[PDB]
Design a protein around this nucleic acid. Structure first.
Ligand SMILES: C[C@H](CCC(=O)NCCC[N+](C)(C)C[C@H](O)CS(=O)(=O)O)[C@H]1CC[C@H]2[C@@H]3[C@H](O)C[C@@H]4C[C@H](O)CC[C@]4(C)[C@H]3C[C@H](O)[C@]12C
Ligand SMILES: C[C@H](CCC(=O)NCCC[N+](C)(C)C[C@H](O)CS(=O)(=O)O)[C@H]1CC[C@H]2[C@@H]3[C@H](O)C[C@@H]4C[C@H](O)CC[C@]4(C)[C@H]3C[C@H](O)[C@]12C
Ligand SMILES: [Mg+2]
Lengths: 100, 66, 1341, 352
RNA sequence: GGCAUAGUUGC
DNA sequence: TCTGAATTTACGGGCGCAACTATGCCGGACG
DNA sequence: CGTCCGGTCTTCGCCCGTAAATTCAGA
């Protein structure tokens, strides 16, 4: 956003809803805002090998089929990691509480 | 370690409530251990005032009286 | 063209790619699997025929007699599907099979037997699968979920570094059979190969080899190359193949024919190999050190002593060389053991083990299998024969044999079920080669190694398991029976087969209670691919490998639709287009591309086959003829997306939506949503509740109609015709003349299922959607079930949504609802609840259902009738009495004048003890049905007689109207036939309609047809009479209730829960929320026109969880409702049809290159008015999954209406009347009501019933229990200074009987003080430790 | 005998029915299902309930909205006691029947008893001590608990269908413990770190960020204002936009003295929104903490400084007021999101 | 009113 | 031919909390 | 319907710790 009606132009911090809602720190961060407009970055196969051709389209433009397939690799791995890491976290906190 | 530190406690009740109940109970029975129930889990199991917060005065009275 | 069902509401489509393969029958897997389980198979490969031919014929241990198989038949189901659901018995058909028994007499290997005897024996009941793919087992609709287990065959694993922690990647070969004992070949850190059976104790591999009757020299020859050492003159001249000299360092100076090819010390190079190859060197002198390390191939004997000199598989030395020099052994055989290409694994295996003879191996393996028993040769031999060489105890499937041969690069794909020596030899050779380095192990999670067990295969397996037991019984009895005395009835016992099949269909990890609250829920539960169940994984064992999505899941298994929780990835859902191969592997369609022309033929490719090809993505732009416009098209050759040339393409994805589930394909703008939120959206789309009225989602995907019609919720028209009589509970179709079968006339009747209970307390209601005199076509929809609209699946409603924070009432994800949504009752949902009271034949006399109850006046008895049962239609409320039963099983007999003292007091306390069937507290509704079941000889009460008479009259009625419809059609057809060849019309009415058997017609086949229809009339009348009598007998007869129950009374409530703060609601893009306030309509934000919004969501829920698909859906729905509003305005003031059709065509033609192209010139200006009438509430939009509407087209559709192009309007506040700056997003998102209602979650407890073992409160809400103060909650209190609160929590309020009693009484007295006491749970622990030899006691203070 | 004791040590667990190992005494006093981790360290408790939670942003930080039906079910003994104390029912049976029938007089009794009787709200996975906190009940018509928005960060509890349990302390010691240790007012700072754990989360922070910001030019830019009060008067009347650079006269009290607040009047150059917010801040804080954009971290630092300088009651009142104003002005802002807000970088064509 | 299984919800 | 050490192998224990719905079950084989 | 005694087929995870058996490295 650049606003001026009293003479020369002057830049200012934008009012854009996504940027306001991210800079304010309410919800979202650099990663998510980047994924909305910019290319959504590098995603890795479950082996850990990073795919040569990453998703070159954001969420505003549509993700073609294979880009979505890579994205679901990532998301499924994340959900499984959550579901099978909560167990280790619970065990660790139980052990710590029963020590001290 | 935390596991071994909690398993090897002066009072068998805490370790028994922790993992390895069979081994801890076997150790206590063989050695004829005795419990002073001076912890938190132990009083919780017994079901009396905790020696942590508002019950600390009550346990101070306990230590005074005997 | 359109089939007159889509001509009522032409759903606008934005797709670009033209559909090639239409969506197949979505329930194809279940239907086909069971169809190949009950249909007779002449070849004997499928179904019960396979099992019977596998087990039968059966002989005795001696050639006495044999029982053999003829053919099997499925009888008429005793009870119909609706009757089975109502009564509660399994929907099954008796299994009747013909068996012929023959007896072999003395010297009768082929001679004629003494007699032949046959009967149609009965073996149990086989549950049947209804037209919807579901089973009915005990009155509940259960569906068998297909299983995805490891295919039988041979698999090679790595276990890279987790074992031995030294970087030694092992290699173990597993031979998984379809049924039998596993055989695992394994390596060790010492490079010695070991075999383990059934994953029992490990043992050296050569034990099995020797048990196969192989001598050590034979094994060495089989598994190694031979090097010939010749004692020609001296120095032990050697035979050398130059090809084997590459990869090592020459330990000597190589020379032959006077040429020093390589000097001493320098390794063997490539050029040295070339020199040796070109000079054709075959014999070379060698030093005496070269033999020092080699191994003798085969055992050798001496001519002096006549005994052994060097055992097979032992390292030769100078001593052995000297000993054999005088033995005359000029020619010597040695095995070639290269260090890094051909390791000496088998030699070390032979050296390590102690066993040497076959019997030694047999006894060792017998000891391993059977520890403790004194071994014997006979038992060991029988055991090893039965382990891997018996057709009964071990059986590689046909698919197993195919995979086993394929993994070993064999040629034939058929063979014997049992293993063979060659098979084990080849498996071990392949394992050795993999260990060397040539070849690669096979990944476990490849979709080419996981079959799809459907219900048919599992049912066949369980049936075979039952046949094993019945065959054992028959064989045991077949030796000890008087043959010529009985038919083959006592021969076969039906108990085992029936028990096994009932156990499988009733209680199994794959026989699941059906998630029945949406058509989508049913259709996605039937297409479920579960990795759990027998023969498969367990959710707490596998992980991090089977959970994740593999590159081969493309096109076969949905990646994004999988439940989140303990089992994520193990409960995958089948893709839309995926089929099942003959062997059971998942295959998906592809479009053949021979040359640059994209042919229109579809090839299905299994996972393994897809690998050796290259397939183009669906989104490949084409021209009219079909040619990839871009010279380099993206494809996927070997699990790797890459940009290949226009030429190399061999296949193209059939459609852009073949990678998703049938449930995840309904999420519009799916490509714009992050995978996590798409998964959540599908999961909660499965859980919507059918509202009172469906509302045709404005922004769909075009897959709604397929899902709705395929799932058995709508009443699709079996034959096209013209509707004749359609009321709220019946549809009658007059079959067209063309489609009418020759003979029976024969006009279809559809009985709609009115309000009935579902498996999740939801109402399954079918209502007609066609008017009288409206034609219909085959496959057309006549009635739409729950959450359906005109054949389109509409789970929830859509309403005007506005994304903006509103006073914090939508803080985290909460949703603010306008009171208009409640007023219109568009989220009101009908829940049908079933309550049953039983009269058990308990001691102290039976129980009675009389209306006379004590301790309650006539006020509580007002709703009950004279028979102690509530009226149908009573507006019952919580705490009332439904079926007042009082038990003669009451209380004690007179004790010390108990009754005398009661009479003295003034009150009559009798054996009449009040039980009651009271509605659960806080539940209101209406009684819609009462059904009473009574065993024979119990004298059903007056209400039972009345309901029985009503049901009998209703059955006689329904049959009478069925006959009347059939005869109306029959007489109409006869009249139509009469119009040619002497038509009588003036006097035809004079004679009665029935008296058409005296008609005067000429000599042609038309009078033959009239006589055929007379025969049809006779058949209809007689069968009507017989069926009426049979139905009356069925109604009047008793019921096979549970043992000891007199009568059961089931009362069906119908509660209506509209909406309230707490009811969870979510869109389709994984945006959840619980209603926070039923805001007044005047307080809501409203636009300039003055239309208040309905829902106010939270904008902050968009960025963090990147489900931008909901924003685009909001814009598209806003545009669709703009078009609908334009149509509604053009229709509110009457306008010429010309302008209306012009506008509708302009709307339907809007797009970039849409492939719908509906022409309105062929609607006759009459259907157009109906189209406008149905479109006035917003034009439906179809948006395929990954070929959806781009944002530019959304802008165009906005601009067609008067709406703003940016998608954001200016909203004025409802309360303060002032404008909101920063104009907001407003539109019509399609939102659902999830089946998580607050009143189903709210729960509280002061004090109620307690448990028994530990005197603690009960757990749960179905029983009036209390919350669990878990361990971390106690830690939370301990971290606090909360001591007294904790003691009160886990001492007084939980299980201190004296403590809780005194606390209750003190609180009643108004004093808040407690007696701590001691918990009784600790007393339980003390007693349980004392039960052992552990003496635990509390010492004196 | 071995099977009767720890079963499964030798051979196989002998099974009795349907091929599942039988529980033995050792298996009955060991493990997750034993009497230790199932009925000793954690026990089912009466006077408890459960339901879905809801926002209810009108509540103060020290109270929670309890459904009326749950309130009636939980406090049944207390209602009996009050009914007998007032003599409206001689026998417990009569009081029980009166409570069941839900007369018009029982509700007044429930209101009388709920006055100063804190209840504990405890979400399912109580990871840390803040997972359980006490609030004073407020009778709410409905079936869902209305929980104060600020403590959601403490519970890690969004409003997408989360359920929380209620617990009713009975004894005087338990009530005093809840009031003096477990009220949300006393739990401002997390035990792990000194940072506050009631920082405004999602809508309050957006509202404050929108309020305290400056654009180059807005309605009534540059005018001089005599104080925050007329700044609010201007904004409500619509004369000057919420974000307009102006000059305001500020009275900021600093306590540099020996525990005395020393006034100071100056002319600060800020925006209308900043002044309107400054009308909420207590006396003892400097104005410089409201002259910035007030992101989430800035608001958290504001609250932390308020706690450090003033005390506890000022910080609790400040949290309530900051939540209220943030919600109000976020609503007034109408900060929405649209597909045209995710602007593509038109110059990414050359980059790609 | 206790066990087993299946499914589901929040983390 | 013995004998202590370090290593390897075998085998015992752990794998979070809270809540809701449904079904099936005490066992199938002799008087 | 009423009483009354009990055993073929199944493995199939990962990590850690501690105790038992095997093997060095000598004397
Ligand atoms: C007819 C077909 C061959 C066609 C060429 C072969 C190939 C694989 C065979 C099925 C699988 O083996 C699994 C299963 C094994 C059971 O034991 C018997 C039933 C099952 C369903 C088999 C029936 C049939 O035999 C199949 C379909
Ligand atoms: C329209 C149609 C004419 C076809 C030539 C006639 C022929 C037979 C008629 C039905 C039957 O009578 C059974 C039943 C009797 C009830 O009382 C009223 C409803 C029913 C369904 C009737 C409606 C209608 O009248 C029918 C379909
Ligand atoms: Mg939540």
């Amino acid at each position: 956003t650049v606003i001026n009606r009293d003479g020369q132009e002057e830049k200012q911090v934008s009012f854009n809803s996504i940027y306001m809602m991210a800079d304010s720190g309410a919800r979202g961060s650099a990663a998510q805002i980047r994924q909305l407009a910019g290319m959504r970055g590098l995603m890795a196969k479950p082996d850990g090998s990073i795919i040569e051709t990453p998703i070159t389209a954001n969420f505003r433009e549509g993700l073609n089929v294979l880009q979505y397939f890579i994205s679901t690799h990532g998301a499924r791995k994340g959900l499984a990691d959550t579901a099978l890491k909560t167990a280790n976290s619970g065990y660790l906190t139980r052990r710590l509480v029963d020590v001290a | 370690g935390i596991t071994k530190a909690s398993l090897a406690t002066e009072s068998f009740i805490s370790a028994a409530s922790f993992q390895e109940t069979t081994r801890v109970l076997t150790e206590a029975a063989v050695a004829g251990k005795r419990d002073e129930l001076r912890g938190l889990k132990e009083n919780v199991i017994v079901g009396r005032l905790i020696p942590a917060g508002t019950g600390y005065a009550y346990h101070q009275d306990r230590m005074r009286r005997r | 063209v359109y089939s007159y069902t889509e001509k009522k509401r032409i759903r606008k489509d934005f797709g670009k790619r033209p559909q090639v393969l239409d969506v197949p029958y979505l329930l194809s897997i279940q239907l086909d699997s069971f169809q190949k389980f009950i249909e007779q198979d002449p070849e004997g490969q499928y179904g019960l025929e396979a099992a019977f031919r596998s087990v039968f014929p059966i002989q005795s241990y001696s050639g006495n007699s044999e029982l053999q198989y003829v053919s099997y038949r499925l009888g008429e189901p005793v009870f119909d599907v609706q009757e089975c659901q109502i009564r509660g018995v399994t929907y099954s058909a008796p299994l009747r099979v013909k068996l012929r028994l023959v007896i072999y007499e003395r010297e009768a290997p082929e001679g004629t037997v003494k007699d032949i005897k046959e009967q149609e024996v009965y073996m149990g009941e086989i549950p049947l699968m209804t037209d919807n793919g579901t089973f009915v087992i005990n009155g509940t609709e259960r569906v068998i979920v297909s299983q995805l287990h490891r295919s039988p065959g041979v698999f090679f694993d790595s276990d890279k570094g987790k074992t031995h922690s030294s970087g030694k990647v092992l290699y173990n070969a597993r031979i998984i059979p379809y049924r039998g004992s596993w055989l695992d070949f394994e390596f060790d850190p010492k490079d010695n190969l070991f075999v383990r059976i059934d994953r029992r104790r490990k043992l050296p591999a050569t034990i099995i080899l020797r048990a196969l009757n192989y001598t050590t020299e034979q094994i060495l020859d089989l598994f190694f190359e031979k090097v010939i050492f010749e004692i020609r003159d001296n120095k032990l001249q050697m035979e050398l193949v130059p090809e084997r000299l590459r990869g090592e360092t020459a330990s000597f100076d190589i020379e032959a024919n006077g040429k020093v090819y390589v000097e001493k010390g320098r390794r063997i190079t490539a050029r040295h190999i070339r020199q040796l190859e070109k000079d054709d060197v075959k014999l070379i002198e060698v030093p005496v050190e070269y033999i020092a390390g080699k191994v003798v191939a085969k055992d050798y004997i001496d001519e002096s002593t006549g005994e052994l000199i060097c055992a097979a598989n032992m390292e030769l030395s100078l001593d052995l060389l000297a000993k054999l020099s005088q033995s005359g052994h000029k020619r010597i055989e040695t095995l070639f053991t290269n260090d890094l290409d051909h390791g000496p694994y088998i030699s070390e295996t032979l050296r390590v083990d102690p066993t040497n003879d076959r019997l030694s191996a047999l006894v060792e393996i017998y000891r391993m299998m059977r520890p403790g028993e004194p071994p014997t040769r006979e038992a060991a031999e029988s055991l090893f024969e039965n382990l891997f060489f018996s057709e009964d105890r071990y059986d590689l499937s046909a698919v197993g044999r195919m995979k086993f041969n394929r993994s070993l690069l064999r040629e034939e794909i058929e063979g014997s079920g049992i293993l063979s020596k060659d098979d084990i030899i080849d498996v071990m050779k392949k394992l050795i080669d993999i260990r060397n380095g040539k070849g690669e192990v096979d990944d476990i999670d490849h979709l080419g190694n996981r079959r799809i067990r459907s219900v048919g295969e599992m049912a066949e397996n369980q049936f075979r398991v039952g046949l094993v037991r019945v065959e054992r019984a028959v064989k045991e009895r077949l030796s000890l029976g008087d043959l010529d005395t009985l038919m083959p009835q006592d021969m076969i016992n039906a108990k085992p087969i029936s028990a096994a099949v009932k156990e499988f269909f009733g209680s199994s990890q794959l026989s699941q209670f059906m998630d029945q609250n949406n058509p989508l829920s049913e259709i996605t539960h039937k297409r479920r691919i579960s990795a759990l169940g027998p023969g498969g994984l367990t959710r707490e064992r596998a992980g991090f490998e089977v959970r994740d999505v593999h590159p081969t899941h493309y096109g076969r298994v949905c990646p994004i639709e999988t439940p989140e929780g303990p089992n994520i990835g193990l409960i995958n859902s089948l893709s839309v287009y995926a089929q099942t191969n003959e062997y059971g592997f998942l295959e998906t369609p592809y479009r053949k591309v021979t040359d640059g022309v994209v042919t229109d033929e579809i090839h299905y490719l299994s996972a393994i086959e897809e690998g050796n090809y290259v397939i183009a993505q669906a989104n490949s732009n084409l021209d009219e003829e079909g040619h990839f416009v871009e010279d380099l098209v993206t494809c996927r050759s070997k699990g790797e997306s890459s940009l290949f040339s226009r030429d190399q393409v061999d296949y193209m994805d059939v459609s852009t939506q073949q990678v998703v589930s049938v449930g995840a394909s309904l999420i519009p703008f799916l490509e714009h949503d992050d995978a996590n939120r798409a998964l959540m959206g599908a999961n909660m789309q499965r859980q919507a509740v059918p509202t009172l009225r469906a509302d045709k989602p404005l922004v769909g995907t075009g897959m709604e109609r397929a899902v709705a019609v395929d799932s058995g919720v709508t009443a699709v028209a079996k034959r096209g015709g013209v509707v004749q009589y359609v009321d709220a509970s019946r549809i009658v179709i007059k079959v067209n003349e063309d489609e009418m079968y020759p003979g029976e006339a024969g006009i279809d009747i559809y009985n709609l299922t009115k309000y009935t209970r579902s498996n999740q307390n939801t109402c399954i209601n079918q209502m007609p959607c066609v008017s009288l005199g409206e034609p219909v076509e085959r496959g057309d929809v006549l009635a739409d079930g729950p959450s359906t609209d005109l054949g389109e699946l509409a789970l929830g409603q859509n309403m005007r949504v506005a994304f903006m924070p509103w006073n914090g009432y939508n803080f985290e994800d909460s949703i603010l609802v306008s009171e208009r949504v409640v007023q219109e009752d568009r989220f009101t949902t009908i829940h049908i609840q079933e309550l049953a009271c039983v009269s058990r034949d308990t001691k102290l006399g039976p129980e009675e259902i009389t209306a006379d109850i004590p301790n309650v006046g006539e006020a509580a008895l007002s709703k009950l009738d004279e028979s102690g049962i509530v009226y149908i239609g009573a507006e019952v409320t919580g705490g009332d009495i439904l079926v007042g039963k009082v038990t003669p099983k009451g209380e004690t007999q007179l004790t010390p004048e108990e009754k005398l003292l009661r009479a003295i007091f003034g009150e009559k306390a009798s054996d009449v003890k009040d039980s009651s069937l009271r509605v659960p507290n806080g539940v209101s509704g209406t009684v819609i049905d009462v059904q009473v079941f009574t065993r024979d000889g119990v004298e059903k009460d007056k209400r039972a007689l009345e309901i029985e008479e009503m049901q009998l009259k209703q059955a006689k009625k329904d049959l009478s109207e069925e006959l009347q419809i059939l005869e109306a059609g029959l007489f109409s057809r006869i009249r139509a036939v009469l119009v040619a060849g002497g038509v009588e019309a003036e006097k035809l009415d004079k004679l009665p309609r029935d008296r058409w058997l005296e008609l005067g017609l000429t000599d042609e086949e038309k009078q033959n047809q009239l006589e055929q229809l007379a025969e049809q009339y006779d058949e209809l009348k007689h069968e009507f009479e017989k069926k009426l009598e049979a139905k009356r007998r069925k109604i009047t007869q008793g019921d096979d209730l549970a043992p000891g129950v007199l009568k059961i009374v089931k009362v069906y409530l119908a509660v209506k829960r509209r909406i309230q703060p707490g009811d969870k609601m979510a869109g389709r893009h994984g945006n959840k929320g619980v209603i926070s306030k039923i805001n007044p309509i005047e307080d809501m934000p409203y636009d300039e026109n003055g239309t208040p919004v309905d829902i106010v969501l939270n904008p902050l829920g968009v960025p963090s969880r990147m489900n931008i698909g909901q924003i685009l859906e909001t814009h598209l729905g806003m545009a669709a409702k703009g078009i609908g509003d334009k149509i509604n305005a053009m229709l509110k003031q009457q306008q010429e049809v010309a302008k209306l059709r012009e506008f509708i065509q302009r709307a339907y033609d809007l797009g970039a290159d849409v492939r719908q192209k509906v022409d309105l010139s062929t609607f006759s200006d009459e259907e157009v008015m109906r189209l406008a009438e149905n479109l006035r509430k917003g034009m439906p939009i179809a948006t395929p999954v990954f070929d959806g509407a781009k944002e530019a087209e959304i802008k165009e559709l906005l601009k067609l209406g008067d709406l703003p192009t940016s998608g954001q309007i200016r909203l004025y506040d409802g309360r303060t009347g002032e404008q909101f700056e920063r104009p907001v997003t407003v539109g019509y998102m399609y939102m659902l009501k999830l089946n998580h209602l607050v009143d189903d979650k709210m729960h509280a407890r002061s004090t109620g019933s307690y448990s028994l073992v530990t005197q603690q409160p009960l757990g749960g809400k179905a029983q009036f229990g209390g919350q669990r103060f878990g361990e971390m909650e106690v830690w939370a209190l301990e971290a606090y200074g909360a001591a007294y609160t904790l003691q009160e929590m886990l001492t007084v309020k939980s299980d201190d009987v004296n403590g809780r009693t005194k606390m209750y009484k003190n609180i009643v007295d108004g004093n808040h003080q407690m007696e701590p006491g001691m918990p009784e749970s600790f007393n339980v622990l003390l007693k349980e430790i004392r039960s052992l030899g552990i003496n635990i006691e509390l010492e004196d203070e | 005998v071995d099977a009767l004791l720890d079963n499964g040590r030798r051979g196989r667990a002998i099974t009795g029915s349907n091929k599942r190992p039988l529980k033995s005494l050792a298996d009955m006093i060991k493990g997750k299902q034993g009497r230790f981790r199932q009925n000793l360290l954690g026990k089912r408790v009466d006077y408890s309930g459960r339901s879905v939670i809801t926002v209810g942003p009108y509540l103060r930080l020290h109270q929670c909205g309890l459904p009326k039906k749950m309130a009636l079910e939980l406090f049944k003994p207390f209602i009996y006691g009050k009914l007998e104390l007032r003599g409206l029912a001689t026998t417990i049976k009569a009081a029980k029947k009166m409570v069941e029938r839900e007369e018009a007089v029982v509700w007044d009794i429930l209101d009388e008893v709920i006055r100063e009787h804190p209840v504990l709200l405890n979400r399912a996975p109580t990871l840390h001590r803040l997972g359980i906190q006490a609030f004073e009940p407020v009778l709410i018509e409905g079936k869902a608990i209305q929980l104060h928005p600020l403590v959601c960060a403490a519970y890690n509890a969004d409003f997408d269908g989360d359920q929380m349990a209620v617990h009713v302390p009975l004894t005087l010691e338990a009530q005093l413990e809840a009031r003096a240790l477990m009220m949300s007012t006393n739990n401002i700072l997390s035990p792990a770190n000194g940072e506050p754990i009631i920082v405004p989360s999602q809508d309050v922070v957006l509202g404050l960020y929108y309020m305290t910001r400056d654009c180059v030019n807005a309605k009534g830019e540059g005018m001089v204002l005599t104080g925050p009060k007329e700044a609010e008067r201007l904004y409500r009347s619509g004369l000057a936009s919420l974000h307009a650079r102006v000059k305001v006269r500020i009275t900021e009290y600093e306590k540099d003295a020996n525990g005395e607040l020393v006034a100071k009047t100056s002319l600060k150059d800020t925006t209308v929104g900043r002044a309107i917010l400054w009308m909420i801040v207590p006396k003892g804080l400097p104005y410089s903490i409201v002259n910035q954009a007030l992101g989430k971290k800035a608001i958290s630092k504001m609250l932390n400084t308020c706690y450090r300088i003033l005390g506890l009651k000022p910080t609790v009142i400040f949290a309530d007021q900051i939540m209220y104003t943030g919600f109000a002005y976020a609503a007034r802002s109408g900060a929405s999101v649209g597909i045209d807000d995710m602007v593509i970088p038109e110059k990414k064509h050359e980059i790609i």
